[PDB]
């Protein structure tokens, strides 16, 4: 169909939770020139455990990435809308689930 | 629904609930947003600890909006993390 389109006018700089979290993370650039957007910043948990009250890595808990399913554009004149999974940040999980 | 793909929302020290943000004039119409259950984080004994805070991790995502359409950049909470005032 006639689309007749019109043209109109880094996570470290927007948020620092990556450094302040008990499950801290680093951000890595996933580059792809044949994909829109070309650069995607992915969160990678710094530690297996979480940072406890004394500042040590505690292995009674785990840093895990929170992954979000996002639609991305790819070249395949022709394009394809692909569903990709990206790590936005990390959270701390424990094996004991409490009620409160 | 994110509850069926992942259960970190219930196992995190900064747990969260998922709320449906409905909009028929936006594509997609339904967006599941994470809302932290507590202000504090769940400590080693199972209590809400206020020496730390549950905070949402927000992601900037492109969404479609209303023959004519516009591509808008929106911010969504994917989940929660636990932050402390002491950085080690």
């Amino acid at each position: 169909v006639m689309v007749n389109l019109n043209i109109h006018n880094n996570p470290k700089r927007s948020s620092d939770y990556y450094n302040r979290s008990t499950s801290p993370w680093n951000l890595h650039r996933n580059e792809d020139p044949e994909r829109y957007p070309s650069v995607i910043w992915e969160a990678k948990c710094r530690h297996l455990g979480c940072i406890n009250a004394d500042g040590n890595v505690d292995y009674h808990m785990n840093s895990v990435p929170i992954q979000q399913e996002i639609l991305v554009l790819r070249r395949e004149n022709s394009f394809r809308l692909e569903k990709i999974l990206v790590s936005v940040g990390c959270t701390c999980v424990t094996p004991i689930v409490h009620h409160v | 629904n994110p509850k069926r793909s992942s259960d970190y929302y219930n196992r995190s020290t900064s747990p969260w609930n998922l709320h449906r943000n409905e909009d028929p004039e936006r594509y997609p119409s339904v967006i599941w947003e994470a809302k932290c259950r507590h202000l504090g984080c769940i400590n080693a004994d199972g209590n809400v600890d206020y020496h730390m805070n549950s905070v949402p991790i927000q992601q900037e995502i492109l969404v479609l909006r209303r023959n004519s359409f516009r591509l808008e950049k929106i911010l969504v909470s994917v989940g929660c993390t636990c932050v402390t005032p002491i950085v080690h």
Partner: antibody
Amino acid sequence: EVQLLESGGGLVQPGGSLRLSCAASGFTFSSYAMSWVRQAPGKGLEWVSAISGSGGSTYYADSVKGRFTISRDNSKNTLYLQMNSLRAEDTAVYYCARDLIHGVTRNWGQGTLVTVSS
Amino acid sequence: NFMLTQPHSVSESPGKTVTISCTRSSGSLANYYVQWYQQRPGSSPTIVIFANNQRPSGVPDRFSGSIDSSSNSASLTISGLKTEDEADYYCQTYDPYSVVFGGGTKLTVLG
């Protein structure tokens, strides 16, 4: 209800290869670290390998390093264990296990028998 | 790496309290969660205790877990011992890389 169903076991010649599968259901598979544990007949439980929920981190017992590969398909809810260069000492019932965190196993599968014999 | 030492067997009478110990060779035991599994003949292991002292539903109140920092050992306690408690018991723990099981303990209910 948590279900872990192992497949792929059987007879393998020494120096041979075999791939085990574990089909999981009753839980959100991608948010759980998974493990392989083996038991030779009339002997104790021996940890083999572990993999994080995302598949980004893998761990191996010294006795299987280089020869085995743990992997997972989160869209298929399947855990795999690729075994290369098999030896008689690898003969065991192989169990698939669900972990709440790394090293905390909460559920076990029924096992699949692997026999390494000429 | 590290090892976990368990007694090869333990024998007690019905209604008595039995303790199975698990001693860690290296690394602080209190830094990593201890699990305990029961294995009946020709069966898959089942969890009795996870995360040092957590008892899943279906596991009788008679089973309890504890840890001792000074002795670097974990214990599985069974109070009000029953004939149905005969089985093999394995302790298990980990470090940032490895996962280790103890050698196992054959529990014999006497008389």
